[PDB]
Design a protein around this ligand. Structure first.
Ligand SMILES: CC(=O)O[C@H]1C(=O)[C@@]2(C)[C@H]([C@H](OC(=O)c3ccccc3)[C@]3(O)C[C@H](OC(=O)[C@H](O)[C@@H](NC(=O)c4ccccc4)c4ccccc4)C(C)=C1C3(C)C)[C@]1(OC(C)=O)CO[C@@H]1C[C@@H]2O
Ligand SMILES: CC(=O)O[C@H]1C(=O)[C@@]2(C)[C@H]([C@H](OC(=O)c3ccccc3)[C@]3(O)C[C@H](OC(=O)[C@H](O)[C@@H](NC(=O)c4ccccc4)c4ccccc4)C(C)=C1C3(C)C)[C@]1(OC(C)=O)CO[C@@H]1C[C@@H]2O
Ligand SMILES: Nc1nc2c(ncn2[C@@H]2O[C@H](COP(=O)(O)OP(=O)(O)O)[C@@H](O)[C@H]2O)c(=O)[nH]1
Ligand SMILES: Nc1nc2c(ncn2[C@@H]2O[C@H](COP(=O)(O)OP(=O)(O)O)[C@@H](O)[C@H]2O)c(=O)[nH]1
Lengths: 441, 429, 429, 441
């Protein structure tokens, strides 16, 4: 059984998961009290709730997910909220003080105190698995728990397990919008485990999502609650071919085989094409052809980036619903035709399509409309180096005067560690300079 | 007598064969449950070519379904034709193949092949006098490519003299839906060279082209393209199952299709293909069918024969037809197009004529061509191969699984040598 | 004529035989109450092999139930088949055996065996012409091991020429549910060597393996594994009870199964075993049944025959079958697998064919094998034995009960000598 | 008839028995006024009340138990309480002053005055037995009556009877928690009869039970009343295969044959796996496989101990309820697989399973939930030597200055007896050093 583990770390990581685990409840037809209703005398793990829901006896569905925070407060929104009996009580693990936007606290001081209790929750879910697929860590670069703790966990998960996929859903720091002033300190130090221990790190940021809500979608005033329903449709599609039938299904490992060229070039941005408001959902031509072109739009990116500034290296089309493939292959051939879209010269064969039959669900009270088709495009590009150049420069400014150093050293790390994680990220940005360039003879 | 073991492998392998045993199961009037509901005793004389009769007149195929993923098996079981297979023939692992060749050939394939060759010996030990085998698989998949060529290279050690042929789907650069399908296709072309008796190379673009232009379809799925392919695979072994005026087994083709060893890559072709509606406007005749079998737009391989020369062809007709018209049309072709044939072979064409058409029309035919123009396939792959491999892209997912570089460079050279085998036999007198 | 006295002993002995006399009581159409409700007069001609007819056509078995614990007896009485036994045959003490060999063989066994041999003489003095006996018991229990071998070693003093065989359950290291079962099994293997005519060694793991793989069960209990075993015990003496084309008593097997004295440890096998659902997909034939009887995965002894050589086998078929197919299949086997047979014995196989299948299907068979691979059993025990005994663990519960050390060391040596008896007869030409 | 005798000595021994004899009342369907209700026209000693309940004429069930205290006060909670007519009047034997945490008083001074009246109560229950199994002494090491009197009784029970099993349910002194300061004096002196006269001594302690209530069970604030319902499920399962049907039944003597290697190596700790709170009883996977693994947990121990510090010597699985054996044998084979679990090298064949069909009862007002399966694992390990090293060191501290010696000598024992019982316990702890070690050649 294609089972998978969600881990939701820190405030952002928890609050995304609300929006994730809201959705799968609708995907598999599960009430917020964990119950499938009486109109499901059909095949459950044939609808495959069984990758995200261990079926407790007597018709009861509890996730394979763990909600971890160093602060009591965030998870206590999940107790009560409405999800107060969806979750297993023992998978909502609270500390007492958060890392408090301090990587040294989340990794050394506070994080170690709950790390074995969290790893022991993993084993209780790891031993219930048959054919474990991998882990889905959610966090934010630029928290304390999202960076400090996640770094501590990913070390321990690499040692105990090794073999499985470990996906990350990070939130990257936005170039203008930021709310912590040590936001770049906590991102340089999380660089270390993100490239080494994760197998595929995704990056999103809040400004590139603000664009999409306002422009494609005509929401006046987004909150985090609005953005995370969007986040969840990207992840819901990723992991949908594990758990629904379709031609050209794609396991969690078939991403990495088809998306990732080299060891540490594993930072693909996602998109999602049918972000359409109810009114704008008429005046649609929402065919396969238009929605494939919309993925390649530099405005429909989930990262503050412009693929017109770099070259794509792989793409990866994951479609849901009322789909005929030859419409897709004719829309690929258009994509190969255009010269505004630069692939690299060593790719040649562009990219991997994957289709699934299960259409998305419209989240109730949600922002989307009812669409028939839907497409994430996970896509390596050299344009995500530009996100890095805009953030190294913020780190290099503050660390030039050794600003907030005294908080960090007095918590269980060294001054020396800044100089290593800065070199470490400077080497990544040098890899994408050398991976964009073709070789000639 | 003259049984055929069917080893459908991978995802693609299972989809085709799903539709394949929906045709054969109509040829012989097999119920979905497995009972017989025919009327003509032709359907039973040679049922045993594909079907074991079981207790109480149920008919269980001799097919073995192999996978590294539970999904396709559960689909087939739960579908219209789940009932038809024996449940000990649904052999499958749990961990997916990765669309990785190494993962299906060394790590997770070798673990399973013991539990599958033990099923091959259930089938092979029950037959009267086995003729051949067959994979249905995909060059460009994990299990179709990797696990398929592990099964093949372990059958030649057991059954070293049976016609083992493949219906292998080959990649086309116009339609890509996998990034490392050059890696996965290169390392399996290497195995098909030394190990196989006939290889029916099929593409994707060539099947849309039939749907769009000839059949006048609108919206093709895998469901529709393999429905074509299964009408080819039925044609191959028709004279093995039905009586004819000329007969032609698997072995009969093999023998006079294949000049040199190693050049066993065939281009199928089917005719007729009309839309519905445009059937009352074609008169259906032997010159009508011949013209479709030699037109480029009715090749299920995405090439143009005009970029080379047919070494040899075979023409397998199915229907109540004449022999003069057959013997003449097949003559008037290799006169009018004598520069499209290799001239050091007289009578490039072999005809076979069955008596039994498919269950909707009269006078079908099947073209199987050994053309030199198939090096157009092997070069379009060995250009993508050599463009990724010069960077050593996607390498750690392969060297991680028990392979190394030297398996690549040799397998690239084994593909690039047989380009220089079709090349020699095209030109040079 | 040719009566069989049944001595089911211990807890395990009683459970099997409970299910054993539910099969035999179906073979002959015996009501739960003890009346006869058959239709065919085959069921009565040879009813007397197991059943005393009593007053007014009630049929009381010749079984004696022995225990050192009231519990199993009360279960059997209160169940569906309590009515069937004679109440003077429920012989039992009060103080439990301890899963201790000494306690069942010397202290609390000797006290009771007088009151049991007096029941053996009720049965033996009523028979026309007795053939044999049988324990059903467990090497690894207190009463199955200890009290069983006290009953045996006191019957050879009374009835020194009757075929006394056992269906003994032997321990497997993969499934342990008793700590000193090496102590209890070692001291009873010692007694089975010198005292028994045939010994059908049965394990636990070998019975799950049949349930999981072959039968496709989900959740086996003792209830399910002994339901298998009872279908073997029915097969043994079929030709004693039913007419056949070849007949075969207890004595007929014994004679040509056993090359040398002392090597009387057999491996049963049953065929067919299908799941329900997968019965309309096997055609049921003599080559179908033969392949199950020689496959390793249908052994009720947790060994692989491939780790040795069959000295001799017997093949006991039950059904309306041919004799050529029998005589051929049993030939084609000891040709194709001639290195799996001891070559100093020509025609390792004995066939017997009854006419009467079990009451659900046609054409069953039963494989009984004298393989050299059974030393794999005796060594896995004599490794656990010698690992506890070097510390002298659990010793005071044994020396406390009338035994001493020198009974151990000799009994360890009697087990380790017959490992060097299967070893001699495997190899050396 | 498989009859057995409970003896409940001292304050702790009485107050456990309340929680024992509460339970069997529910097991066999007996009202607190000793009556089976009218819906039992089924087989009584076939449900086998007849091991713990002599059926008085006219449908009335009185135990085979004796409640002994040197203090009037404790048993007077049983007169009245609610059990005031469950018990036979003459089996509630009171002194007038307790031993008062003084071993010399419980064994020589006060104990002898009631010892013949107690042994004569035993004979009145011994002569009513048909197939007497043995005795179940309950007490605490570190009382006066629990140590001093129990030592006196066990001498007399060995002389009159000899042959039968004599189980003990001790409470061992906890390393931090203690309430008597001469707690180690009374434990060294009870060492003598515990190894010599008992056949199988169990040890529990209060801290290892505090853990389980708080952690597995989410009780905020345990009292003795809470702990002893737990104690009683361990004993209720021990003695359940005597008195209910199941495959692989286990008499009282089949423990000792399968649990106990050598003469004085008979100190096995128990566990109990399904300690689950009502809320946490959903979010269960409470299969056989998980509950077998839970026995081998160093946190689910009933002793302040960590089997990761010693090697197991035998284990002993006693299961109740909805059980399929092959699930157990597949869970054994997992246990043999792991290398964190050290058996010894002379065991080889691990351990003995026993199954029973009768599911536990949820004690009303009790702490457990409704579980379908349940498992005690009685298990010899060399890790119980560590409990001893932590208590000899407390004795050796106080006896270095001869602290409370003047109370003990002036009550009917010698200074010399401390030096013999210290050597006696030092030899036990030397036996477990020499029993953990394999022999090599
Ligand atoms: C009235 C009439 O003559 O109609 C024909 C027809 O119009 C044509 C166009 C048929 C038709 O086929 C298709 O349109 C088609 C659909 C999906 C994939 C491939 C083809 C036909 O559907 C398919 C059908 O085929 C058969 O019945 C054969 O026995 C065939 N069987 C199947 O595959 C099958 C399909 C659907 C339902 C039941 C059986 C076969 C072919 C080769 C080997 C074994 C069996 C036939 C002759 C026709 C129709 C019904 C219109 C054609 O195909 C075949 C496979 O015969 C397409 O080109 C040929 C030429 C036929 O003349
Ligand atoms: C339609 C049909 O043929 O059904 C069969 C059947 O499906 C199979 C699968 C049966 C079936 O057995 C089981 O499923 C099974 C259940 C518990 C324990 C062991 C087996 C069958 O239940 C059992 C049943 O057995 C008998 O009736 C024999 O007389 C058998 N008797 C019993 O053990 C018995 C069963 C139930 C009640 C009372 C007695 C026997 C075999 C050898 C020697 C003496 C007697 C049979 C043939 C069948 C069913 C009914 C489905 C099989 O078993 C036996 C012992 O025959 C399992 O593998 C064999 C092969 C059979 O073909
Ligand atoms: N023709 C073809 N076959 C494919 C392709 N991708 C995978 N396959 C086949 O599918 C099988 C592998 O199963 P896969 O799709 O990886 O299983 P999954 O775990 O469900 O993704 C192999 O037999 C492949 O040859 C493709 O692009 N074309
Ligand atoms: N199949 C099998 N039979 C057993 C096993 N253990 C004991 N027996 C049988 O049970 C009887 C011996 O009794 P035992 O179980 O020791 O008695 P009790 O333990 O005092 O009730 C004999 O007939 C044995 O063949 C076992 O593990 N498997």
């Amino acid at each position: 059984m294609r089972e998978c583990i969600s881990i939701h770390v820190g405030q952002a990581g928890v609050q995304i998961g609300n929006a994730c685990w809201e959705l799968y409840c609708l995907e598999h037809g599960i009430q917020p009290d964990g119950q499938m209703p009486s109109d499901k005398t059909i095949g459950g793990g044939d609808d495959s709730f069984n990758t995200f829901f261990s079926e407790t006896g007597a018709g009861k569905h509890v996730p394979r997910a763990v909600f971890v925070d160093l602060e009591p407060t965030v998870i206590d929104e999940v107790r009560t909220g409405t999800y107060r009996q969806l979750f297993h009580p023992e998978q909502l693990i609270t500390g007492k003080e958060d890392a408090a936007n301090n990587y040294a606290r989340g990794h050394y001081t506070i994080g170690k105190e709950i790390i074995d209790l969290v790893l022991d929750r993993i084993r209780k879910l790891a031993d219930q698995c048959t054919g474990l697929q991998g882990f889905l860590v959610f966090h934010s670069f630029g928290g304390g728990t999202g960076s400090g703790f996640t770094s501590l966990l990913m070390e321990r998960l690499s040692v105990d397990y090794g073999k499985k996929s470990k996906l990350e859903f990070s939130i990257y720091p936005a170039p203008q919008v930021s709310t912590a002033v040590v936001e770049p300190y906590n991102s340089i130090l999380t660089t270390h485990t993100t490239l080494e221990h994760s197998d595929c790190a995704f990056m999103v940021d809040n400004e590139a999502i603000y664009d999409i809500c306002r422009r494609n979608l005509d929401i006046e005033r987004p909150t985090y609650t609005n953005l995370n329903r969007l986040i969840s449709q990207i992840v819901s599609s990723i992991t949908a071919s594990l758990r629904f039938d379709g031609a050209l299904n794609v396991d969690l490992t078939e991403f990495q085989t088809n998306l990732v060229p080299y060891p540490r070039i594993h930072f693909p941005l996602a998109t999602y094409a049918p972000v359409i408001s109810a009114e704008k959902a008429y005046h649609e031509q929402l065919s396969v052809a238009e929605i494939t072109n919309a993925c390649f739009e530099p405005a429909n990116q989930m990262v503050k980036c412009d693929p017109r500034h770099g070259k794509y290296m792989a793409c990866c089309l994951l479609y849901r619903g009322d789909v005929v493939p030859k419409d897709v292959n004719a829309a690929i051939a258009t994509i190969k035709t255009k010269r505004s879209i630069q692939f690299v010269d060593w790719c040649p064969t562009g990219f991997k399509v994957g289709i699934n039959y299960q259409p998305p669900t419209v989240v109730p009270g949600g922002d989307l409309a009812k669409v028939q088709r839907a497409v994430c495009m996970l896509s390596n590009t050299t344009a995500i180096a530009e996100a890095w150049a805009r953030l190294d420069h913020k780190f290099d400014l503050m660390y030039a005067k050794r600003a907030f150093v005294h908080w960090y050293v007095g918590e269980g790390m060294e001054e020396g560690e800044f100089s290593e994680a800065r070199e470490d990220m400077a080497a990544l940005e040098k890899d994408y300079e050398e991976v964009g360039v073709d070789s000639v003879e | 007598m003259r049984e055929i073991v069917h080893i459908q492998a991978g995802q693609c392998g299972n989809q085709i064969g799903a539709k394949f045993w929906e045709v054969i199961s109509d040829e012989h009037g097999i119920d979905p449950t497995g009972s017989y509901h025919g009327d003509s005793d032709l359907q039973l004389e040679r049922i045993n070519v594909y079907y074991n009769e079981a207790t109480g007149n149920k008919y269980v195929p001799r097919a073995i379904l192999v996978d590294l993923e539970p999904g396709t098996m559960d689909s087939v079981r739960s579908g219209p034709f789940g009932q038809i297979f024996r449940p000990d023939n649904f052999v499958f692992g749990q961990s997916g193949a990765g669309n990785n060749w190494a993962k299906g050939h060394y790590t997770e394939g070798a673990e399973l092949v013991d539990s599958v060759l033990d099923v091959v010996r259930k089938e092979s030990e029950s037959c009267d006098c086995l003729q051949g085998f067959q994979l249905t698989h995909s060059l460009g998949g994990g299990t179709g490519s990797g696990m398929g060529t592990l099964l093949i290279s372990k059958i030649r050690e057991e059954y070293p003299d049976r016609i083992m042929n493949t219906f292998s789907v080959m990649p086309s650069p116009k339609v890509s839906d996998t990034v490392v399908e050059p890696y996965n296709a290169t390392l399996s072309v290497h195995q098909l060279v030394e190990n196989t008796d006939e290889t029916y190379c099929i593409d994707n673009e060539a099947l849309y082209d039939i749907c769009f232009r000839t059949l006048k379809l609108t919206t093709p799925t895998y469901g529709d393209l393999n429905h074509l392919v299964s009408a080819t695979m039925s044609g191959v072994t028709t004279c093995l199952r039905f009586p004819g005026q000329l007969n032609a087994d698997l072995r009969k083709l093999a023998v006079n299709m294949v000049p040199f060893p190693r050049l066993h890559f065939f281009m199928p072709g089917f005719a007729p293909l009309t839309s519905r509606g445009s059937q009352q406007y074609r008169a259906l005749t032997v010159p009508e069918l011949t013209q479709q079998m030699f037109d480029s737009k009715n090749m299920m391989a995405a090439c143009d024969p005009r970029h080379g020369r047919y070494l040899t062809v075979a023409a397998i007709f199915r229907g109540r037809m004449s022999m003069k018209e057959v013997d003449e049309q097949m003559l008037n072709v290799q006169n009018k197009n004598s520069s499209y044939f290799v001239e050091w072979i007289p009578n490039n064409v072999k005809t076979a004529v069955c008596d039994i058409p498919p269950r909707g029309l009269k006078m079908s035919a099947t073209f199987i061509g050994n053309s030199t123009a198939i090096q157009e396939l092997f070069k379009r792959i060995s250009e993508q191969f050599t463009a990724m491999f010069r960077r050593k892209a996607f390498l750690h997912w392969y060297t991680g699984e028990g392979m190394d570089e030297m398996e690549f460079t040799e397998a690239e050279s084994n593909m690039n040598d047989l380009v220089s085998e079709y090349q020699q036999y095209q030109d040079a007198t």
